[PDB]
């Protein structure tokens, strides 16, 4: 059982924070997007382009359920992880930290050049607003703790988290 599951829109910090939240607790971090690229031997960019999100979402669903019982440290979920009705029920009972972010910073932190299937230019922001709107509800449903990583220092966020994870 993960010491904490991290969910949030791509660009919310899931990785930056998943590392500091894991290194501070003394437990390895784990990414579902990365776990899938291993169990399949295929890049998520391909699995999407060739087989499709439909099938991908299934594979992710199976991989997540797999980590919710195997991993003992910090677990990080892919953006649309919470769109899978099955994934949301596997999260029931876990410590789920929803890292919130506004369309402003979210898009500013994702304008790099990593191949994001669901977030590709042009109008890469309209796409972000949509993802945010459509999913925001979902993240609330599975989140046992809502932390804002918007205006904050990657470390000051982990600071905030650990306190609320030790206090009732
Ligand atoms: N709490 C925070 N405050 C300030 N900037 C932060 C932040 N957390 C992360 N960032 C910045 O946001 C950028 C993207 O962060 P991150 O890589 O964690 O996205 P992500 O893991 O949510 C996306 P994906 O789901 O695609 O893997 C980095 O440049 C990072 O420095
Ligand atoms: O927003 C999403 O649903 C995604 C986020 C990434 O982590 C990858 O899992 C993939 O690009 C899909």
Curated annotation (Swiss-Prot):
Organism superkingdom: Bacteria
| Catalytic EC class | transferase
Q: Which SUPFAM superfamilies match?
A: P-loop containing nucleoside triphosphate hydrolases (SSF52540)
- Which Pfam families would you find in this protein's record? SKI (PF01202)
Q: Which cofactors must be present for this protein to function?
A: Mg(2+)
What is the documented function of this protein? Answer: Catalyzes the specific phosphorylation of the 3-hydroxyl group of shikimic acid using ATP as a cosubstrate.
Q: What is known of its domains?
A: Consists of three domains: the CORE domain which forms the binding site for nucleotides, the LID domain which closes over the active site upon ATP or shikimate binding, and the substrate-binding domain which functions to recognize and bind shikimate.
What is this protein's record name? Answer: Shikimate kinase
Q: Which gene encodes it?
A: aroK
